[PDB]
Structure formats: structure tokens, C-alpha cells
Amino acid sequence: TTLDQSKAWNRYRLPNTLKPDSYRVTLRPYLTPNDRGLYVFKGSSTVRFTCKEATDVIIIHSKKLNYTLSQGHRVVLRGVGGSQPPDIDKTELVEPTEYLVVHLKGSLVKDSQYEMDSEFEGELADDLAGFYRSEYMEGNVRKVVATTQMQAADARKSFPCFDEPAMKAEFNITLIHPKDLTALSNMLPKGPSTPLPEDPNWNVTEFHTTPKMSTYLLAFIVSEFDYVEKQASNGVLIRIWARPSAIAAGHGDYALNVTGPILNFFAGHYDTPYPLPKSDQIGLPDFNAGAMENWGLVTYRENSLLFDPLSSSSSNKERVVTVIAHELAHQWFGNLVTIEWWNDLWLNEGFASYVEYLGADYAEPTWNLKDLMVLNDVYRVMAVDALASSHPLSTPASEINTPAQISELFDAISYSKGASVLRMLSSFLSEDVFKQGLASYLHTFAYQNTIYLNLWDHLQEAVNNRSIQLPTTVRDIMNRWTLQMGFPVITVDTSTGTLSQEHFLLDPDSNVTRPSEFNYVWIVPITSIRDGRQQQDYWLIDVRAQNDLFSTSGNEWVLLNLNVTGYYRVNYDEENWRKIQTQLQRDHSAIPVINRAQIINDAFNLASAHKVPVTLALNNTLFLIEERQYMPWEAALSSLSYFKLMFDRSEVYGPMKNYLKKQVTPLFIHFRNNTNNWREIPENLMDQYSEVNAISTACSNGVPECEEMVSGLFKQWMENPNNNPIHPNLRSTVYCNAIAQGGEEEWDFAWEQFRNATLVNEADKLRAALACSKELWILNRYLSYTLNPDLIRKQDATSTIISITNNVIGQGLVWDFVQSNWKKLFNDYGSFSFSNLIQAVTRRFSTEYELQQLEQFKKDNEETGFGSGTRALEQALEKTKANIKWVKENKEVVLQWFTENSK
Ligand SMILES: *[C@@H]1O[C@H](CO)[C@@H](O[C@@H]2O[C@H](CO)[C@@H](O[C@@H]3O[C@H](CO[C@@H]4O[C@H](CO)[C@@H](O)[C@H](O)[C@@H]4O)[C@@H](O)[C@H](O[C@@H]4O[C@H](CO)[C@@H](O)[C@H](O)[C@@H]4O)[C@@H]3O)[C@H](O)[C@H]2NC(C)=O)[C@H](O)[C@H]1NC(C)=O
Ligand SMILES: *[C@@H]1O[C@H](CO)[C@@H](O[C@@H]2O[C@H](CO)[C@@H](O[C@@H]3O[C@H](CO[C@@H]4O[C@H](CO)[C@@H](O)[C@H](O)[C@@H]4O)[C@@H](O)[C@H](O)[C@@H]3O)[C@H](O)[C@H]2NC(C)=O)[C@H](O)[C@H]1NC(C)=O
Ligand SMILES: *[C@H]1O[C@H](CO)[C@@H](O[C@@H]2O[C@H](CO)[C@@H](O[C@@H]3O[C@H](CO[C@@H]4O[C@H](CO)[C@@H](O)[C@H](O)[C@@H]4O)[C@@H](O)[C@H](O)[C@@H]3O)[C@H](O)[C@H]2NC(C)=O)[C@H](O)[C@H]1NC(C)=O
Ligand SMILES: *[C@@H]1O[C@H](CO)[C@@H](O[C@@H]2O[C@H](CO)[C@@H](O[C@@H]3O[C@H](CO)[C@@H](O)[C@H](O)[C@@H]3O)[C@H](O)[C@H]2NC(C)=O)[C@H](O)[C@H]1NC(C)=O
Ligand SMILES: *[C@@H]1O[C@H](CO)[C@@H](O[C@@H]2O[C@H](CO)[C@@H](O)[C@H](O)[C@H]2NC(C)=O)[C@H](O)[C@H]1NC(C)=O
Ligand SMILES: *[C@@H]1O[C@H](CO)[C@@H](O[C@@H]2O[C@H](CO)[C@@H](O)[C@H](O)[C@H]2NC(C)=O)[C@H](O)[C@H]1NC(C)=O
Ligand SMILES: *[C@@H]1O[C@H](CO)[C@@H](O)[C@H](O)[C@H]1NC(C)=O
Ligand SMILES: *[C@@H]1O[C@H](CO)[C@@H](O)[C@H](O)[C@H]1NC(C)=O
Ligand SMILES: [Zn+2]
């Protein structure tokens, strides 16, 4: 499986002998099939490169490209500035390393430039890689758009190139396309699209030269899309593309309104202007990758770019602002200054995942979006990073070579832990000094490439220049958070005022085998409060220490990690927990809203880790009966979802629902009178989210008044279908519960609304809600639909199946389905997420019978692998073993607790 490593063309990393300067690329997509039923694109290119060290071979990336021979060879070599290229000996293609290899009869000379001409063609496949095709239905008409996805190593699939991020170059892009179609790229066209002289049916669009940039950020799109535009004061043209009908109705308007302000924010937050003449953002009906930050032409999944104020919810709105903010952040951080190699992906994706909140907050200052990062990124990644199977943020460059190894880095660790760690960094340094660090870093390395130590250097300079006191260097502090996996749990003893830290692990029976330089002790910044008042900062530099900041006497209490800015969990002594609970009972508002969620989330997590009694966590939810903020409720609901997954098929679920029924009812009554009987929605975003959770928790836990009103609204809709009386914020929870309470009539109505849907946001809500039927035959019939591309789009297959197994009645149904035709499923679905299916179907597993079924599932499907889901299967087995143990230990205690507190 390994080729001769002594040969440069058998090594995954490019050699350092040749460095490109300028490319010219002409592409011509054919949007109709040929004789072999293949969509093909024709291409021609020229790469001008500099010989940095004398070499007798040209090694360049090439993937699935078929070359037209010219002058006897795959390629033609020319000189520039009087250089004399050697004759070509022969060319070959090396598939594993994805190289075009041009062997020369002599050596290129050092410092001299050369040009290589190539003429080729490739498949315009339905594969979402390189230059590919995307198909959607515009009514009964089948539309085809040629578009691109280069990240991380697929630029080489559209034209031959030195396809590594630090091989920056300039690109002259020309698109040959049908007459009535718009061509788009990174830069603006040099002029109006002109007819191809050989065939007026085609047009030629030549784009201006790009600045120095990485191949993975290139973009070519040919479509019949329309646009809304808006020109900013500083000259930057802002355009937004989508299907003509979607833009005609104004669904691109909101994205347009926020793009300007977001670009303005980043211009100031970075202290460098927007480096491009324009900003294109395009919404594609099909785009599994979510969004790609191509420089000047950012591609989005349609349902994340388009917005309809008459049917899209606030979450839909929040989705748009935050995603746009993320990708636009890359237009400086990532595109202007690019990573040296893929092992530093966490710095790029982590930074954008963090500042997406800052940008979006600028566009919508009334929302307080920044507060949501703790739930969305911090606690999300903490579930995965608290496992023995996690990995450090940073990876040695030499360990990331193959395309598969690169793809594995695009995970929750890189994004969410990357964001969390950087937010913590911007916290213990002043944000102002963090900004100052950013500014110099950007200016210094513009149009170039960096490793993460470069950013550390510039931040360190800002620290010295601003005279910010730290326990040690920025480098040494951050090493604790990048070189080793996981995060600490800080246990506080408020009697002695001593702090203690250790590697936090969700599984009490975990087996960490990955060694660490520091042996899992961190240098950690501690912000804290006492009786609502914030104290002086502290630095924990050892396993254990003492300070009077964490000592208490009498009725006073303390709390660590203000607003959860630090990437760690906190535990307290029994005495301190009691005072905090008493504070929550007396006046919970005295504790920051984020920290109220912390108290709950940490407690439930520490409970699973055998660090607090499970009854403690449950006690930390008692105050929720008078809690009206969204965040603390959401945190408890998220943690109790595990309890639901463990107990919703047992005797425990009864008292559990009765408890949640007791806690949420006053909140439900409140919103009922607050919104004046659901006539209005709150003006504050959090309150809007809070109301939705209240209604959602009320109905699923059996409060009568909620059940009556959701089915009442839905029947009212069934009578006025073209006049949906249900506010968008409430649609998912109302559709679902009404479908659950009703039967065939409701389901068929919802199904027809889904089939006729012209708004993707609405169709997504219907798809999920349809899985809420309590009729087994209906769910069974729905299951058969999920594999039919005419009924359910393949990109929505897994999620629709997943939504079905979320239903208790669908659990055994889907699990039987997975066991029955896995062999047919692994063959006849590509990009079907077996990983998510395996995880979703095994979440409920808590018995020895389920484990043995899963153990047999693995054995029965040995010779036919599990592919991308192979890893999820091993984690499901370990999780199942953990669940069996947890259930047998907490079943009695939890049943008793829910019973006592349901009265
Ligand atoms: C991708 O696209 C870029 C941008 O268009 C191309 O770069 C251009 O390439 C042109 C063709 O070689 C260049 O034209 C030449 O410019 C020479 C002057 O060079 C200076 O360039 C700097 C900027 O780098 C300016 O500040 C100076 O003011 C000058 O413009 C001329 O001397 C040269 O002379 C011509 O030679 C031709 C040869 O046939 C004669 O026919 C003609 O009569 C005339 O004597 C010529 O005009 C151009 O400078 C250059 N533009 C820039 C800004 O770099 C890349 O070549 C493209 N890449 C690929 C691989 O195709
Ligand atoms: C650049 O060159 C590469 C390498 O040659 C091309 O890749 C090749 O693509 C073809 C599809 O056109 C693959 O062919 C196979 O097709 C069968 C199914 O179709 C079959 O058609 C033949 C007649 O040609 C019949 O005799 C058979 O009964 C059958 O109907 C399918 O079973 C295979 O899975 C495969 O798709 C071929 O495998 C593939 N070659 C390699 C080695 O990758 C590529 O198309 C070309 N690019 C362009 C732009 O044409
Ligand atoms: C969170 O921590 C625990 C969670 O359970 C709570 O402790 C509970 O506090 C109440 C306070 O009223 C205790 O009630 C007491 O119970 C005794 C009798 O003991 C009982 O005996 C029967 C058998 O006869 C057992 O089945 C019970 O388990 C219990 O041992 C009775 O005289 C009074 O009702 C007395 O108040 C309750 O026992 C206790 N739960 C436990 C430990 O089982 C705690 O309050 C809560 N903290 C909060 C509210 O924030
Ligand atoms: C995208 O941004 C545009 C531009 O701001 C928004 O359009 C504008 O929306 C406002 C608020 O509804 C409208 O204000 C109105 O002004 C009139 C006076 O002209 C006043 O009588 C009304 O009471 C109201 O306040 C304004 O007409 C409108 N401007 C344009 C260009 O039509 C739009 O709302 C934004 N779109 C989205 C979905 O965010
Ligand atoms: C492709 O080229 C043709 C010919 O230049 C363009 O057709 C012109 O389009 C403009 C704007 O719509 C019309 O006002 C002219 O009458 C057309 N010129 C003719 C008839 O020769 C066409 O616009 C180009 N396609 C694109 C991408 O717009
Ligand atoms: C902790 O986070 C809270 C938000 O959960 C912050 O409270 C906001 O602070 C900003 C400062 O500009 C005010 O404009 C907002 O009105 C506050 N929101 C609310 C609803 O209180 C708070 O600043 C943070 N505390 C610290 C010091 O870290
Ligand atoms: C940086 O700090 C130094 C003093 O430490 C001083 O020159 C001035 O305050 C700042 N200006 C720069 C960038 O030198
Ligand atoms: C969907 O739209 C078509 C075209 O108007 C119509 O015939 C059909 O009844 C619609 N389906 C329903 C029942 O919503
Ligand atoms: Zn990103």
C-alpha cells in the first residue's frame, strides 16, 4: 500500500524546488450529458513558476483530469524572460499522491521562471468536489449549475496546480459558458460577457487577476441565478445571488442588509480594510458543506442564506447572520492571511467560529448573541473533549499528509474548542490588546502564510507594549491548551480557600492512554464573583493552591468562571453548593444568567463523572419554576435530554414528565398572559427562544392547556391552509405536537404542505414534525419514503431517519431497519452519513440486550465495512457500556427524586 518513498513523486508533500507565481485558467462546463451519459468540462491552463532549486522534474497536483496530448506529451514547457526549458522526457500520473509528473531531459536553472501549458478535460460529477455539478428542481424543470468546492485538496481536480495553501499565486480565470447564463468568480469581470466567436451559443467571461491567494479559495460558478446588490460607501460592491424566484420575492434581502455592517465591523476590528473589490455571496439549493469562504465568492447552503420574514423563524434569522459573519471573517483571517499547512486548521476555523458572534452582534446588537456561545460551542465541544478518545488542538505538521488525514481535522475540536480557547485568550488579555495583536499580525503577514506561533508572537508584543501582567509568556499559557487534549475541572474548597485541578473525564471508568507533555495540568485564568460582586482575577499555575479570594465565612458564597469565559468546569464543596442553591431560591437574578446555566450544566456533567451526587444536579433545577430567561432553561433541558434518552421507555419517565410539568407550567402561564394568548411574540430574542422552549416543554410533558392550543392552531391552519396562523417561531413545536396528538388527517395535511413547499425553512420543519406521529404504521410508511429521492432528497435522508428514531415508537422501528438492510444501505444509499445514523440509533441503549444486539451488528457486518461510521460504532459500544452502568446506579435515586419533587 506504500510506494517507493525515495522518489519525490511518491511523497504527499510537494517538493520545495518549484514555486508558482501566476496561473491562467480557462474552464468550459457542459451542462448536458454526452454519449457516455457524463457531464464534462473542458479546460486549458498555463502555470508560470519559479525554480527555487535546480531540478530535472516538474511535480504538480492533478486529480481525475484527462489531458490532450500536444507536441507528443501531456504538457508543453515554455521559457519566460529568456529562460530555456529542457526537453520533456516523459510525463506520468501518480494516483495515490495525485501528481502530474513531468520528467525533463535536463535541469531548470535556479531563480529562472518557466511556463507550463496544459489542455485537459474532467467530469462535472455530482460529487461536490472541485469543478462539479449541482442539480435542483425549478418547478417541473431540472436545472443544472456548474460550481466549485476546493477545500481542502480539490482545486487539482479542476486544473493542474501546486495545490497547497502556502503555494500562493495570482489567478487569471476565464469561464466559457452558455449564452444566457451568468458566470461568477473571485474577482469582477474585466468587461461584459462576450460571444464565443466559434459558437454564439456560448459566451466568454474573463475575470480580473486575483491577488496572491491559495488554490483552495478559488471559485467558479455558472448559473441562471439572479441577484440583489448594494454598494457600500468605501466602494465595495455587495451582491447576493440565489434562484431568480427566491430573489424576486426578496428572500435575499436580509442577508444583503447585514453584509455591509458585518464588513464594516471586521474592517475596524482588524484595522485593515476589506482586501477585495467586491463581495459575492451565493445560496445553493444543494450544498452539504454548509458554507465555504472562497475569496470574494462565498457559497452557502440555500436554507442558511435566504430568509423570509413571513415564514422563517428567529432561529432561521440568527442562522443567517452568524453564518455570514463566520465566512466574512475568513475574508481577512484565513484568506488574506492563510495557514501554512492544514495542521493549523483549528486556528483558522476556531477564530471564525469565535468572531462570528462578534460580527453578528454588530449587525444585531439587540440580540446578545455573544452569550449563546457557551451553549453552542463550549458545552458542545466539552461533551467530546471530556472523552479519552479526544485529540489535542494542534497537530505536528509532519503527521498531516494524506487527503484523508486533512479531512479528519474538520471536527468539533478544531471549530468549537478552537473558538472557546481563543475566546479565553481574548479574555485574560484585554480584548483591546488582543485586537492590537490581531492588527499587527494581519498587516505583517498579509498575502502570506503563518503558523499559530506567529499570532502568539504578535500577541506577546501587544502584551509587552501594553504592560499586561501574566504568569508567564503567551506561548507557555496557550501550550497547555493546544498541545494536550481535554480540559480541567477546578474543585473549590470554600472553607480553606484552596483550588484544585485535574483532567476532567465524563466516564468514571475512562482509560486515557494518550500521553501529555504537562501530564494534564493547565495554567488557567480564574474570574470569580462573591455575593454578585466580581472579585480580583487569579491564575492557577499548579495542581493545587490557596487564595483568600476563594474563602468564605457565614452566609457568603463564591462562584468561579464569570460568564464561562474559561475552558474549564467548576466543582464546589457541599457547603458552597447549598448557599448557591439558596441564592437561586431567594433571588436567582443575583447570579449572572450564563452562570445559572453553568451551575446546571456543570452539575449534570460532574454527576456522570461521579464527582457529585446525581441528586445535586437535579436540585440545581428546582429554581427553574421561577426562571424566565432562555439560557438556564436550555442548559437544563439539554442535560435532561440524556435522562429522557435513558428513561423514556421505563417507569422512570412518568415522574420525570410530572416534574418537568411542574417546573414549566408557571412559565407557560406567564407567556400565555405575556403574549396576550399567543397573539404576539416577545421583542427580545432570548425571550422569544424562552417562550418556544416553554411551549415545547409544556406540551411534551403533558400540560393540558398547551396540548389543546397547539392542536387548535393546527386545525385552524388545516381550515385556512394558505393563511398559516402559526407564528414561525412556534411552527416546529406546534407542527410536531399536533401531528403527535392527531392521526392520519393531520399527517397527510402536513405531508402535502411538505411536498408543495417552496420555502426550504418551512419544508425542514415539516420533515422533522412528520416524524412525531404516534402511529407506528405511519412512521413505518414514512421510513420507506426517506430512501426515495422523489419524496425525500438524499441530503435530507439521514436527518429524516434520525428524526424518526428520536420518537420512542420509531426507535425500535429504525433500529430494526438498520440491522435488517445495512448491507443494502452501505451499497445503495456517496456521502450518506452512516456516522450520524449509528450514533442516533444507539443513543437510547442502556441494557445488556441492546449491547449484545450491537455487538452482533458489528460481527454480522464484518467483511462489509462501516466506512465513515466505523468510528461511531466503537464509540457507541463504549457509550452503551457506560449507559448500562449509569442506569443501574441512578435508576432508583432518580425515580425517587422525580417522585418527591413532582408534588
Ligand atoms: C495574469 O494576468 C496578469 C495581469 O494582466 C498578467 O500580467 C501582465 O502580463 C502582461 C503580458 O506579459 C504584461 O504586459 C507587459 O508589461 C510590460 C511592462 O511591465 C511593467 O509592469 C509593472 C507591473 O508589474 C508596471 O508597474 C509597469 O508600469 C509596467 O507595466 C511591458 O513592457 C510589456 O511590453 C509589451 O510586450 C509585448 C510582447 O509581445 C508587446 O507585444 C507589446 O507591444 C509591449 O511591448 C507588456 O505590456 C503586464 O505588465 C502584466 N501585468 C501586471 C500588472 O503584472 C499575467 O501575465 C497573467 N498570468 C498568466 C500566467 O497569464
Ligand atoms: C477520464 O479518464 C478516466 C479513466 O479512463 C475516466 O474514468 C472512467 O469513467 C468511466 C465512465 O465513463 C468508468 O466506466 C465504468 O462504467 C460502468 C458502467 O457503464 C458501463 O459502460 C460500459 C461501456 O463503456 C459497458 O460495457 C458496461 O456494461 C457498463 O454499462 C460502471 O460499472 C463502472 O463503475 C464505471 O463507471 C471507468 O471506470 C472510469 N475509469 C477509471 C479507471 O477511472 C473518465 O470518465 C474520463 N473523464 C472524462 C471527462 O471522460
Ligand atoms: C436536594 O438534596 C436532596 C435530594 O433528595 C434533598 O434531601 C431531602 O430533603 C428532604 C427535606 O424534607 C428530606 O425529607 C425528610 O425525610 C424524613 C424521613 O426520611 C425519609 O424516610 C423515608 C422512609 O420512611 C425514605 O423513603 C426517604 O428517603 C427519607 O429518608 C421526613 O421526616 C421529612 O420529610 C424530612 O424532611 C428527604 O429525606 C431528603 N431526601 C433524601 C436524602 O432522601 C434536599 O432537600 C434537596 N435540596 C434542595 C431542596 O435544594
Ligand atoms: C433590508 O433593509 C431595508 C432598508 O432599510 C429595509 O427596508 C426598509 O424597512 C423599513 C422598516 O420596515 C421601512 O421603514 C418604513 O419607512 C416608512 C417611511 O418611508 C414609514 O412610514 C414606515 O413606518 C416604516 O418605518 C422602509 O420603508 C424600508 N425601506 C425600503 C428601501 O423599502 C428592509 O426591511 C430590510 N429587510 C429585511 C428583511 O431585513
Ligand atoms: C452573451 O453575449 C450576448 C451577445 O453579446 C449578450 O447579449 C446581449 O445582452 C444585452 C443585455 O441583456 C442585450 O441588451 C443585447 O441586446 C445583447 N446583444 C446581442 C443581442 O448581441 C448576452 O448578454 C451575454 N450573456 C450574458 C452573460 O449576459
Ligand atoms: C457577563 O455577561 C453578561 C451577559 O450575559 C454581560 O451583561 C451585558 O453587559 C453588556 C456590556 O456592554 C451590557 O450592555 C448588557 O446590558 C448586559 N446584558 C445584560 C442583560 O445584563 C456582562 O457584561 C458580563 N459580565 C462580565 C463583567 O463579564
Ligand atoms: C508601545 O509601547 C511602548 C512602551 O512600552 C511605547 O513605544 C508606546 O506606548 C507603544 N508604541 C509603540 C508601538 O512602540
Ligand atoms: C400542490 O400543488 C398542486 C398544484 O397547484 C396542487 O394540484 C396540489 O393539490 C397541491 N397539493 C396540496 C394538496 O397541497
Ligand atoms: Zn470557517
Side-chain angles (χ1 to χ4, degrees), residues 164-235:
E164 294 186 353
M167 294 284 188
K168 294 203 181 182
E170 300 170 4
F171 298 89
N172 303 340
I173 303 307
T174 290
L175 260 27
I176 307 178
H177 52 90
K179 186 190 305 182
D180 311 317
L181 296 194
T182 295
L184 292 172
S185 193
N186 296 90
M187 311 294 296
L188 283 174
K190 279 175 176 168
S193 178
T194 61
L196 182 64
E198 295 85 352
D199 192 356
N201 287 322
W202 299 76
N203 269 33
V204 184
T205 300
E206 191 176 355
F207 297 90
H208 284 284
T209 306
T210 78
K212 286 156 55 191
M213 69 177 298
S214 304
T215 44
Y216 83 93
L217 294 167
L218 291 173
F220 334 115
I221 302 178
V222 174
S223 72
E224 63 171 25
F225 279 16
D226 197 5
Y227 70 102
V228 281
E229 64 175 5
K230 204 171 191 171
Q231 193 153 44
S233 304
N234 46 6

Side-chain angles (χ1 to χ4, degrees), residues 436 464-467:
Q436 176 174 329
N464 306 338
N465 183 276
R466 291 296 206 87
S467 312

Side-chain angles (χ1 to χ4, degrees), residues 711 714 718 735-751 769-770 772-775 777-778 781:
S711 56
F714 197 84
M718 292 182 65
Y735 292 177
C736 177
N737 290 270
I739 284 175
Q741 295 167 202
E744 190 182 13
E745 295 183 7
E746 292 72 16
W747 199 95
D748 293 348
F749 173 81
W751 178 244
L770 283 165
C772 292
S773 169
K774 285 196 55 180
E775 296 283 317
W777 74 268
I778 287 176
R781 181 181 63 174

